[PDB]
Design a protein around this ligand. Structure first.
Ligand code: MG
Lengths: 409, 83
C-alpha cells in the first residue's frame, strides 16, 4: 500500500530533525541541534503531529543502532548493520588549535601539581589524548589533599569543556543506585570521595572494553566504554592501591589557592571564562601516545601503598630479601635493650636473618619484637611463612644440637 | 606535645633530666631516636606502640619522614628524620 517507507524520515530531515528506530533500545531516537533524545512511539507521534500536522499510524523511519563512537562519523555500517552516532562534539571540542595555554589557567595547573612539570605535563598529555583521540586511556588520576586547592575548579573547568560528555561529583550514593547513567556516553567521569572502599569497582571500569548500563525506563544495555576517571579526595584513600599498580596516578595537592600571591576574587571566575582558551591549548597538543597510559610512583602513591599493604607481607618480604636493615629500621635492636637476648645470641639472630636460616626461638623473638606481642610458631607459619611462601620449616644442626628452623627460599 | 601532657614523661620517671632535654631537642630539630619516638607516642596516646606501628600508622601515611641511622653519642642510632 505504501510508496515510500522513509518519507517521514526525509521530511523531518528537511526540517533539521533526524528520527530513527533504535532496534537495540526499542525506542525511537531523535536528533536536533546536536541534542540526542530517545522517546517512546506515542511521544514521537506527538512531535511528528506538531511538525507536519498529521499523525500517521506508521512511523516511516529507518532502523539504526545508536552507538557512542566518538571517532566514527554521523553514521556507518559495520558488517551489514546500519549504525547512527550518539556522540555529538560540544562547542569547545570543535575549536582551533593553539600552542599557548591561558596564563591564569596555567597557574591553576601549576599550583595543582605543586609546580612539578613531569606529572603535570603527563596529565596534559592524558587530557589532550582524551580531548583529541576520545578513547579510553586505561589510567586514572586521583587528586587528593585539602579543599580549595582547585581540584574542584579543575572539574568545573573541564566540565565546561566536555559538557555532557563528563560526569561530575559522582558519590558512593550514586554507585549504590541501581541505575548508572553517569557512565552512559562519557569520556570523563569524575568522583568525589567524601566520608572522611566501594569504588574498587572503578578499577575494572578504567580498563574494561565494555560496560553494562542500567537506566530508568530503558533496557539494560551493554556499550563500548569511553570512560576516563578522575577522583577528588581529601586525605582519604578512595581505592585499595596494590604495590605494583598500573591504573592510578596520585597527586597530593595542599597548595590552597587563597594562600597564593596570584589569587584575586575574580580569579575563580576568570579561570572558567578561559575554558575556551584551555580547550584550544589541548586541541593543539602533539600527543605522545606511549605516555598517556604511563603512571608514576608519586610520593603520595608510595605512602598509600606502604600503609595499605599488610605488615605480615612486609615481614615476609624482609625475611625473603634477607633484609636485616628493615628489621632494624622497625626497631628489632630493642631485643638487646630489654635483655630478651644477650650479645652472643644477637649476633646469631642477625646472622640468621641474613643467611636466611632462622631457628624457631629466634623467629618467635623477631616477630614478637616487631609486632609487639608474642606469636606462636604455628601462627607465624600460618600467617607469614606459609601464605607468602617464605620457605620451609625443617631441621638444621646448629652447633651439635638439631634445631627446628625456617629455611628461607 | 607539652599541651597534650608530654611533660608527664618526667613525672613518672620514664626518663631523667638529661634525656628529657635530648627528647625535646629531638622533636624541635626533627631528628627522633626510636626509643624517644616510642616514649613520646606511648605518652601522648596512653599505651605503648611499637616502632612498626608508629611507622605504619603515623610516619608513613602522613609522610613525616624516613628512618635512618644517626650516630648519637658514638653509637649508631635508629632514628626518624623529619622532612
Ligand atoms: Mg552529580
Amino acid at each position: 500500500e505504501e510508496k515510500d517507507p522513509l518519507w517521514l524520515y526525509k521530511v523531518l530531515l528537511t526540517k533539521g530533525i533526524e528520527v530513527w528506530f533504535d532496534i537495540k533500545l526499542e525506542k525511537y531516537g531523535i536528533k536536533r541541534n546536536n541534542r540526542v533524545d530517545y522517546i517512546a512511539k506515542s511521544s514521537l507521534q506527538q512531535i511528528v503531529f506538531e511538525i507536519i500536522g498529521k499523525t500517521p499510524k506508521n512511523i516511516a523511519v529507518p532502523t539504526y543502532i545508536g552507538a557512542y563512537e566518538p571517532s566514527k562519523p554521523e553514521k556507518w555500517e559495520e558488517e551489514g548493520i546500519k549504525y547512527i552516532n550518539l556522540f555529538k562534539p560540544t562547542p569547545l571540542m570543535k575549536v582551533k588549535p593553539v600552542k599557548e595555554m591561558p596564563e591564569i589557567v596555567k597557574n591553576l595547573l601549576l599550583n595543582l601539581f605543586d609546580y612539578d612539570a613531569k606529572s603535570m605535563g603527563l596529565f596534559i598529555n592524558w587530557l589532550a589524548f582524551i580531548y583529541q583521540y576520545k578513547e579510553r586511556t586505561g589510567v586514572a588520576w586521583i587528586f587528593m589533599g585539602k579543599q580549595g586547592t582547585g581540584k574542584g575548579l579543575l572539574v568545573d573547568l573541564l566540565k565546561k569543556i566536555f559538557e555532557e560528555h563528563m560526569s561530575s561529583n559522582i558519590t558512593d550514593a550514586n554507585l549504590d543506585s541501581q541505575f548508572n547513567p553517569y557512565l552512559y556516553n562519557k569520556l570523563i567521569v569524575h568522583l568525589n570521595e567524601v566520608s572522611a572502599l566501594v569504588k574498587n569497582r572503578l578499577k575494572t571500569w578504567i580498563t574494561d572494553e565494555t560496560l553494562y548500563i542500567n537506566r530508568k525506563n530503558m533496557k539494560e544495555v551493554e556499550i563500548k566504554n569511553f570512560c576516563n576517571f578522575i577522583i577528588n579526595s581529601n586525605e582519604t584513600i578512595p581505592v585499595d592501591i596494590e604495590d605494583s599498580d598500573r591504573r592510578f596516578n596520585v597527586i597530593e595537592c595542599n597548595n590552597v589557592l587563597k594562600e597564593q600571591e596570584w589569587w584575586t576574587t575574580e580569579s575563580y571566575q576568570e579561570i572558567l571564562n578561559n575554558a575556551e582558551g584551555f580547550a584550544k591549548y589541548l586541541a593543539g597538543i602533539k600527543v605522545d601516545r606511549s605516555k598517556v597510559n604511563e603512571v608514576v610512583m608519586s610520593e603520595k602513591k608510595k605512602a598509600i601503598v606502604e600503609t595499605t599493604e599488610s605488615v605480615l607481607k612486609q615481614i615476609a618480604k624482609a625475611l625473603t630479601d634477607r633484609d636485616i636493615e628493615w628489621f632494624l629500621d622497625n626497631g628489632l635492636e630493642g631485643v638487646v635493650e630489654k635483655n630478651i637476648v644477650n650479645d652472643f645470641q644477637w649476633e646469631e639472630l642477625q646472622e640468621a636473618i641474613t643467611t636466611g636460616v632462622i631457628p624457631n626461638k629466634y623467629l618467635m623473638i623477631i616477630v614478637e619484637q616487631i609486632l609487639g606481642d608474642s606469636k606462636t610458631i604455628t601462627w607465624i607459619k600460618r600467617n607469614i611463612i606459609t601464605p607468602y611462601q617464605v620457605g620451609e620449616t625443617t631441621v638444621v644442626k646448629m652447633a651439635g644440637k638439631p634445631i627446628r628452623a625456617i629455611v628461607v627460599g
